[PDB]
Amino acid sequence: LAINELISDGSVVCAEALWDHVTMDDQELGFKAGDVIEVMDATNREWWWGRVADGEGWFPASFVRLRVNQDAQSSKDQMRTNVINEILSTERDYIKHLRDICEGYVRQCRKRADMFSEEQLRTIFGNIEDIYRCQKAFVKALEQRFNRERPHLSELGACFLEHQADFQIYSEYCNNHPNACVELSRLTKLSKYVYFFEACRLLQKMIDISLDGFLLTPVQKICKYPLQLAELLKYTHPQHRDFKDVEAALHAMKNVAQLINERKRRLENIDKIAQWQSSIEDWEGEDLLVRSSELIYSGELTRVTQPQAKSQQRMFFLFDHQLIYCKKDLLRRDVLYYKGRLDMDGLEVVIKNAFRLHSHLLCTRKPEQKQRWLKAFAREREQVQ
Known part of the structure; x- marks a missing residue:
């Protein structure tokens, strides 16, 4: 409970994840057992706000252990x-x-x-x-x-x-x-x-x-x-x-x-x-569980409608074998509407990138975000192979 004050003084409080935290909510922090997490707010009994590398968000406290020193x-x-x-x-x-x-x-x-x-x-x-x-x-x-x-x-x-x-x-x-x-x-x-x-x-x-x-x-x-x-x-x-x-x-x-x-x-x-x-x-x-069993990575991404030429930003969600994309309810972030998906089986990757099989165009706003997607995709094909 002494953590309450250290964060108020501005002190840097670190902890480590004892369990993996799995989530699709873009406001929550996901991590794997063993990762180091900086706790920035511990107002709540359970849900604290934290930060790792590519981001921050809410996470359960009961899932982590505070470094002693x-x-x-x-x-x-x-x-x-x-x-x-x-x-x-x-x-x-x-x-x-x-x-x-x-x-x-x-x-x-x-x-x-x-x-x-x-x-x-x-x-x-x-x-x-x-x-x-x-x-x-x-x-x-x-x-x-x-x-x-x-x-x-x-x-x-x-x-x-x-x-x-x-x-x-x-x-x-x-x-x-x-x-x-x-x-x-x-x-x-x-x-x-x-x-x-x-x-x-x-x-x-x-x-x-x-x-x-x-x-x-x-x-x-x-x-x-x-x-x-x-x-x-x-x-x-x-x-x-x-x-x-x-x-x-x-x-x-x-x-x-x-x-x-x-x-x-x-x-x-x-x-x-x-x-x-x-x-x-x-x-x-088709239901996700039919061909999938694990969320590899998730996060905002802008696709460009190739039928015509318009481009839209959507919340993409890469699971093993398939990439789903949804649109956030403007004026209610917590609400997502299904918009489509793709079959990673056969698809190849080559702040923008595309998918190849037959292509699909996508991009973010920060070089950091792209480089992270490239990973997700590589990990996606590694969990598959």
Whole structure:
């Protein structure tokens, strides 16, 4: 929450994306897990305004992690010590969420077989109870490595390394998570469940987050780890006792978050695309999901009607295999009207450019924008080949 003031003083606040953010709204910021994001406004609880390279726009905060050290041996040790303290702080908080879930929610549900079947409990909670048992041990092992007197000397890499297999159980959790959300959404629509769940919180005295927020913490945590180990390494001496292990812990934790993240990414594209198409006015040809599964790049572009000669600016949207184009409702930006599309299969590219098959003419207002489109297209043919 201290971020409120740093941005007001004009200070430069950076963060890093733990999940990919997928969007077609030209006012929202899209990024891939791991990208650095400058947060310029954090007025809102969740939707902050940010900036990367080719742009800025709104983005969810819960999707990013703030660098511990924003802005020579006493200082350099203090930095590593900051990360060390964050790691330890986030595990202490994360264990409180898991405890609140298991003792405040699960325990209760499992005691009301008349509302939850064994199947539902498994669908809603997954293996959250196993995650809770392992994390309690992990916290204990992290803390025993903590050098209270001289923090920066704490060795944590080996500790991550010793729990490798244990972090493997996040796959099951994250894999079943989409299903939990569906059952939850459903139950959300049933007064008797809405009440029982509220009654759950009014007895466990719980953090003020919804059941949906809680159930997402394990997915965030596992995907956050690579960011934490990474900033730890950045401040670990090239010859620290911990150096080798951290670098190792990082490598292994990436392999886990990457799979979890890619899956989450593939699934969100499917739904964003469907939801998107639907929000669009006067849709015409075949549905996007028929030939597509991923938005490669989007953004304003002006095409020039070759039948006659008029040129119009439109919001183009390149997916794998096809380029759609829409016109923004003058006096209501949020409203788009379908206008057409093209089949990237067969089409070639050669602040203006054209498509070749048989051509189509297009251009922007800034050299920067063109060079970025050329990428999108090259990436488009790479995801295709």
